[PDB]
Amino acid sequence: KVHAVSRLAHRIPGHGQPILSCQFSPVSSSRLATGSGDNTARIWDTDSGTPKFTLKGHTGWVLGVSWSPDGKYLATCSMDTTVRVWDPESGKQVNQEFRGHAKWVLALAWQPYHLWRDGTARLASASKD
């Protein structure tokens, strides 16, 4: 049974621009990911109400954050026509950014974990182009 939330747990600042996306980790509620208009994404430890990592490198507003279904990656899509993959347990970018879109990348979708083949994951990115 899930009981109704009734009171504020933590109000955590740190973003300099409005928050455009938020999503919990599939493992537990302890890890939360937000992406904002300050060209950054952020990880939050929700147990103590504290920041954990600040993912930097986009040059446009981070329009979308999406955890991998197993929870080992975080994919962020931004207004700078790029998608990046980060390691949420270390806050480091995995390899280089994903380039090829011509306009803003608006949405992301991971392939379901039971459909992963060839020893890799697949990510779909929808753009304005």
Partner: protein, 286 residues
């Protein structure tokens, strides 16, 4: 003239015993326990936070007519079961002790045949309510960075609804009315003590060894404190009632009764007192 005469002694009115001992602010206690905004005849709980030289005492207390009652109690020396062996009075240990008391309260209530009138009269559109308590700091000064608010922060993170504001947490800036959650996280995971460890290790090695002689002896580095406190928080949230045995001598209650009565000095009886009075009278006569 003598100010302390018979009239003064007869006219003297003593304070309360705990006021004479200097342990209770009854002016604050009256407003803590006998004041309520609503008159729904509901019980009220307080989180009593006290500090010694070597321990932190946190209790969940209700007030009855013949004395207070303890719902749950957590002590900072019980952190040894969860791996914290040093700094048992620092701000991070205060946070962990408040978290432990919150987890113990929730475990005792089952929020982690006899039953309640709430369950008797529960309606269809009813939700689980949080456990609520008000902070009791005693005679401590409520300044920014105090460990009473670390205990309160740990309890609120553990899941007790405690009404509070954020302007007394470490890292708060009064000129901008903004809280620095980086400094708050540093204090929660003990980064101030670690930063002092590198500061002493670079400036004064002798002072570093003298203050942290147990830290090097147990081989606890400054960089491991964050992982140690995080693992302690996870262990506390996993098993709130882990049993901890101390290194003090262990006997049964009756054995301790015998051991204390071995050293207790007995009060003299009337016959012995009269014998001593007669001996004093004989010595005065001689």
């Amino acid at each position: 003239k003598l100010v302390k005469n018979s009239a003064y002694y007869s006219r003297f009115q003593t304070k309360f015993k705990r006021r004479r001992q200097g342990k209770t602010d009854y002016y604050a206690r009256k407003r803590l326990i006998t004041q309520a905004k609503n008159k729904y005849n509901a019980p009220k709980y307080r989180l009593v936070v006290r500090f010694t030289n070597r321990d932190i005492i946190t209790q969940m207390v209700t007030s009855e007519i013949n004395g207070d009652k303890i719902f749950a109690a957590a002590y900072s020396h019980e952190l040894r079961a969860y791996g914290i062996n040093h700094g048992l009075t620092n701000w991070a240990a205060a946070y962990a002790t408040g978290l432990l008391l919150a987890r113990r309260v929730l475990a005792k209530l089952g929020l982690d045949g006899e039953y309640t009138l709430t369950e008797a009269a529960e309606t269809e559109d009813g939700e689980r309510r949080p456990f609520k308590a008000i902070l009791d700091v005693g005679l401590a000064r409520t300044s920014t960075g105090a460990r009473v608010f670390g205990v309160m922060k740990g309890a609120s993170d553990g899941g007790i609804f405690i009404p509070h504001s954020e302007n007394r947490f470490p890292g708060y800036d009064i000129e901008t009315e903004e809280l620095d959650t980086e400094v708050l996280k540093k204090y929660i995971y003990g980064g101030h003590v670690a930063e002092y460890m590198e500061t002493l290790a670079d400036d004064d090695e002798e002072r570093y060894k003298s203050q942290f002689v147990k830290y090097i002896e147990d081989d606890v580095e400054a960089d491991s404190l964050e992982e140690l406190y995080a693992e302690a928080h996870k262990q506390i949230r996993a098993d709130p009632f882990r049993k901890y045995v101390s290194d003090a001598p262990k006997k049964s209650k009756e054995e301790w009764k015998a051991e204390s009565l071995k050293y207790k000095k007995a009060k003299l009886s009337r016959e012995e007192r009269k014998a001593r009075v007669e001996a004093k009278i004989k010595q005065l006569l001689a």
